[PDB]
Amino acid sequence: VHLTPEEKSAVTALWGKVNVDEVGGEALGRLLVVYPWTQRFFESFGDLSTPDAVMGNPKVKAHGKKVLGAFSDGLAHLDNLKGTFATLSELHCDKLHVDPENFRLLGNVLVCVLAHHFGKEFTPPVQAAYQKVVAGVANALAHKY
Template sequence: MVEWTATERTHIEAIWSKIDIDVCGPLALQRCLIVYPWTQRYFGSFGDLSTDAAIVGNPKVANHGVVALTGLRTALDHMDDIKATYATLSVLHSEKLHVDPDNFRLLCDCLTIVVAGKFGPTLRPEMQAAWQKYLSAVVSALGRQYH
C-alpha cells in the first residue's frame, strides 16, 4: 500500500481540479501513439493511425483518451487502495488485451507532459513529485496481474 502525506494528497487533488479530461485525455493518448508508434498495435480497430494528423484527427483515439484518463482519475477516490481499485482492469489488459504493461508508464509520461504544458510554471517540483508518485502507483496497480 502506498503511503500518502496530506501535502501529497493536496497536490494531487489540485492537479486533478485543473485537468479537463476531455482535453488532456485525447492529447495524452495522441502524444503516446505518435511518440511511441509501437503502442499503436493495440488500436488496430481505430482506423487510420498512419500519420500524426490521422492520429490527432481520429475520434476513436480522442474517445479512448477520455476513457483512459477517466479511469486514471478513479484512483483519486481510492488512494488508500489503488491496487484493488485497478484489479479488474489489470486482468483485462493483461489476459484479454495483452497490453505491454510498460505502455501504461508511457501514457502516464505523456500525460505529465500535457499537464506540465497546461500548468506551466505553476506546476512546482513538489507538485510534480506527488503527481509522479500517484501515476506510479496506478501504473504498478495496472501491471499487477503481469507479475
C-alpha cells in the first residue's frame, strides 16, 4: 500500500469505532449472499439457502469474527502486510484452495459494510484509504500462491 500519513490516521481512527465481532459476521454473511458462488467453501456450515439462513447462521458469524480478527491485526502492521499474512497466504492456497479473487470480493463487501455502519462519516476520502487497505490485504493474502 501507499498510505499517506493522513490516510493512515483516518483508517485507524474509524477502525477504533468498529465492533469486529459484528462487522465480521456482517461482511462474511453478505459475501455469501451477494456472490453465492463463494458458498462453495462452506458446505459444512449448513443452511445457507436464504439470506436469513446465512446472516443468522452461528457458524458464519463465528467464522466472520475470525477473519476480521486476523484482518484487524493486519491493520497494526500496515508496513509489512506480506510478512503479517504469509502463513495465512500459504494456508489458503495449499490447504483451503481458495481463489484469491474471493479476497477482493470480501474487500468490496467490507467497504459497503463500513459505509452502511458509519453513514456520512465514511467520507469519499476515507473510502479511498480503505480501498488501498483492502487491496493491500488481498495482495498480501495472494502472495504465496
